[PDB]
Amino acid sequence: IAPVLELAVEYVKGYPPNSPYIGSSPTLCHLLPVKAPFCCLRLDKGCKHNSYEDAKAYGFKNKLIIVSAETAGNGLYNFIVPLRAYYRSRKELNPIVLLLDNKPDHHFLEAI
């Protein structure tokens, strides 16, 4: 080993547009080139852009991450932010599926 010396779909990189709360530290994250419509964020139903109704029809190339929470708020945002940070590998991005009990409000969907 060398000795230490005593002296020396493509994704854009940017901050999330709508920070959900005051004090949320802005983190440079992997982002879609355009914001996804609220219909395309749903695994259950099909939409104009996609008719998939379960994760197998999506055909993800990396293994999924499932979050089983009751309601989606700023906590789930703080969960998603580290997993999409710019220093995380884009080739190793794990799709995130939020298994919610209640339907998420428009604020969380706009944030994510």
Binding site: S25, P26, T27, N78, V81, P82, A85
Partner: protein, 77 residues
């Protein structure tokens, strides 16, 4: 201790005796030898209370924890 409970398992119940022995000596980290905790399967928010009480002595501890979690982003960190 109940996260991945294997009732018919000798090692998982010897860990109970180990935890009891540690708790006898006044150890706060008696739960630490449980396999789900050691493997990173479960945590408790009580560590956040412990962090808050530690910050009375180590004012830098909360900032260090947030920096490790990426909660706060200072350039050059």
């Amino acid at each position: 201790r109940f996260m991945q409970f294997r009732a018919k398992d000798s090692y998982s119940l010897a860990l109970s005796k180990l935890e009891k022995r540690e708790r006898e000596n006044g150890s706060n980290l008696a739960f630490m030898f449980r396999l789900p905790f050691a493997a990173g399967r479960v945590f408790s928010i009580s560590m956040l209370d412990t962090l808050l009480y530690q910050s009375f002595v180590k004012d830098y501890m909360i900032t260090i924890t947030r920096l490790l979690l990426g909660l706060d982003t200072t350039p050059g960190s």
